Amino acid sequence: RRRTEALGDAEEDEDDEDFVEVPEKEGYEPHIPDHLRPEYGLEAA
Amino acid sequence: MATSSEEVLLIVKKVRQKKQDGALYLMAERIAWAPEGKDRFTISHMYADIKCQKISPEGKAKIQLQLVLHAGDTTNFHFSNESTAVKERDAVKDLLQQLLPKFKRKAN
């Protein structure tokens, strides 16, 4: 399969349209999912 | 010059540039693309020469990135890596929006 099929390419050109503009972040950090905030207001015991 | 590779922050594999398979490497101060197994980057743009970027959105048969320079120039990068196409795209995308303004400071 795959190589036994007519799978060949020499004209798969890159789309030059339909690109969604990607803005800048500057002040951003990927970080990590934090849901361990000890500032809920119930941390009294 | 020519064969030069600074601190690579992002390494993306299988990236097609106008019917040419290669790899895209995000560097500390610039972005460069070179065909697979090549020491010389045929595409080299500093973040200071880029105005903004774009990405071929979901729905297209191929997920890609587009670098729009200051004069309206554009460099298209197709993530032909089926394994992490969308994933590497967003990685380059988010890191670009991160590193682009680091050098981009102009009114165009």
From Swiss-Prot, chain A:
PTM note: Monoubiquitinated at Lys-25 in response to transcription stress; this promotes efficient transfer of TFIIH to stalled RNA polymerase II.
Biased composition (Acidic residues): 8-17
Consequence of substituting residue 19 to A: Impairs interaction with the TFIIH complex
Biased composition (Basic and acidic residues): 1-6
Region of interest (Disordered), ranges: 1-17
Connected disease: UV-sensitive syndrome 3: An autosomal recessive disorder characterized by cutaneous photosensitivity and slight dyspigmentation, without an increased risk of skin tumors.
Oligomeric form and interacting partners: Interacts with the elongating form of RNA polymerase II (RNA pol IIo) during transcription stress. Interacts with the TFIIH complex during transcription stress. Interacts with ERCC6. Interacts with ERCC8. Interacts with USP7.
Role: Factor involved in transcription-coupled nucleotide excision repair (TC-NER), a mechanism that rapidly removes RNA polymerase II-blocking lesions from the transcribed strand of active genes. Acts as a key adapter that promotes recruitment of factors involved in TC-NER. Facilitates the ubiquitination of the elongating form of RNA polymerase II (RNA pol IIo) at DNA damage sites, thereby promoting RNA pol IIo backtracking and access by the TC-NER machinery to lesion sites.
Name under which the protein is recorded: UV-stimulated scaffold protein A
Taxonomic source organism: Homo sapiens
Range within the parent protein: 390 to 434 of 709
Swiss-Prot record, chain B:
Location in or out of the cell: Nucleus
Stretches that traverse the bilayer: none
Superkingdom as given in the UniProt entry: Eukaryota
Function: Component of the general transcription and DNA repair factor IIH (TFIIH) core complex, which is involved in general and transcription-coupled nucleotide excision repair (NER) of damaged DNA and, when complexed to CAK, in RNA transcription by RNA polymerase II. In NER, TFIIH acts by opening DNA around the lesion to allow the excision of the damaged oligonucleotide and its replacement by a new DNA fragment. In transcription, TFIIH has an essential role in transcription initiation.
Family assignment from sequence similarity: Belongs to the TFB1 family.
Subunit structure: Component of the 7-subunit TFIIH core complex composed of XPB/ERCC3, XPD/ERCC2, GTF2H1, GTF2H2, GTF2H3, GTF2H4 and GTF2H5, which is active in NER. The core complex associates with the 3-subunit CDK-activating kinase (CAK) module composed of CCNH/cyclin H, CDK7 and MNAT1 to form the 10-subunit holoenzyme (holo-TFIIH) active in transcription. Interacts with PUF60. (Microbial infection) Interacts with Rift valley fever virus NSs (via OmegaXaV motif); the interaction leads to TFIIH complex proteasomal degradation.
Descriptive protein name: General transcription factor IIH subunit 1
Organism (species): Homo sapiens
Highest classification ranks of the organism: Eukaryota, Metazoa, Chordata, Craniata, Vertebrata
